[PDB]
């Protein structure tokens, strides 16, 4: 399948990690899948596209993020 969205689960919004591919094809599905793939309490979720990644595969330019217990906040 083709990959549109990626996510990371980090300890806070200023920490970076290698992007993991999502199966979702829309943003609303990506948010639901990313919340369901979150392992831990208290972590931060970021979602981005292929253009959100640097050359090392790190998710640095997320299009939306979600602090634990809060709603998704889009960049714009």
Author numbering: 2 to 77
Paper quotes:
Mutational analysis of this surface proved that it is the binding site for the non-specific DNA. The M1, M2, and M3 mutations disrupted the AcrIF9-mediated binding to non-specific DNA as the smeared DNA bands disappeared in EMSAs with target and non-target DNA. The M4 and M5 mutations of Aa1-AcrIF9 permitted the Cascade binding to the target sequence leading to unhindered R-loop formation and the Cas2/3-mediated cleavage. The deletion of the L3-4 loop (M6) or its replacement with the Pa-AcrIF9 loop (M7) completely blocked the Aa1-AcrIF9 interaction with the Cascade. However, the stability of these mutants was substantially lower than WT or other Aa1-AcrIF9 mutants.
The cryo-EM structures of Pa- and Pp-AcrIF9 bound to the Pa-Cascade complex indicate that two AcrIF9 molecules bind to the thumbs of Cas7f.4 and Cas7f.6 subunits and the two AcrIF9 binding sites are similar.
